[PDB]
Amino acid sequence: AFEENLYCDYTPGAAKAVAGKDVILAVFNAAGDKLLAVAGQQGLTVNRSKDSIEITSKDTVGGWKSKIGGMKEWSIENDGLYVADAESHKELAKYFESDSPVCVKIINQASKKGLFGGLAIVADYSFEAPFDEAMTYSVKLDGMGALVDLTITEGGDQMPG
């Protein structure tokens, strides 16, 4: 860690990589007082797409189509090991049964900074039990509105506990 860092450049300037296991998805319980990370997480996907509408016309010059941006959507897919006695799984089941919106938040455990936050609905909640593997769950929630990006917004650093 010395010799003037001739070879081992120990100076931290940027993380330049984020381990996947450090990014987790948590949900707010029915009262919302507690944040609960869903148990047995193994994968996470955050989709954010914006529609494009074509505005080409006979006065368009250049031989290239003309498009402009439009509406936006967002959905989150999570999966992993499933245990029925987990509090987060019970909360998810209650949300699915009662047909109620659920507040979700993607955070980074290692960096202690939250990434995304939104209100979604439990669109899909499925399970699979292969005889030679462990039982697994897969949940998909598409948001009913805006998805606040906490990377460019101050605050939103609360975490489960």
Which position among 2, 11, 12, 58 is part of the footprint of a copy of itself (CB under 8 A)?
2
Binding status of residue 159 toward a copy of itself by CB under 8 A: no
Of the candidate residues 58, 59, 112, 161, the single one contacting a copy of itself (CB under 8 A)? 59
- Answer for which of 3, 58, 112, 161 binds a copy of itself (CB under 8 A) is 3
CB 121, min distance to a copy of itself, A: 4
Nearest-approach distance from CB 42 to a copy of itself, in angstroms? 5
Distances in Å between the Cα of 65 and the Cα atoms of 26, 54, 57, 68 are 42, 7, 9, 10
Using CB atoms within 10 Å of the CB of residue 118, give its burial: 0 to 12 exposed, 13 to 18 middle, 19+ buried.
Answer: buried
Question: What's the rounded Cα separation, in Å, for the pair 95 and 157?
Answer: 24
How many residues in the chain?
Answer: 161
Is residue 122 a contact residue for a copy of itself (CB under 8 A)?
yes
Q: Which of 58, 88, 126, 161 binds a copy of itself (CB under 8 A)?
A: 126
> Hey, which residues between 67 and 106 contact a copy of itself (CB under 8 A)?
67-74, 81-86, 89-90, 93-94, 96-97, 99, 101, 103, 105
Task: Find, among 121, 115, 114, the residue nearest to 145 by Cα.
Answer: 121
Binding flag, residue 110, a copy of itself (CB under 8 A): no
The H or E element containing residue 2 is none
Among residues 11, 20, 88, 109, the one that binds a copy of itself under rule CB under 8 A: 20
- Answer for the pair 35, 159: CB distance below 8 angstroms, yes or no: yes
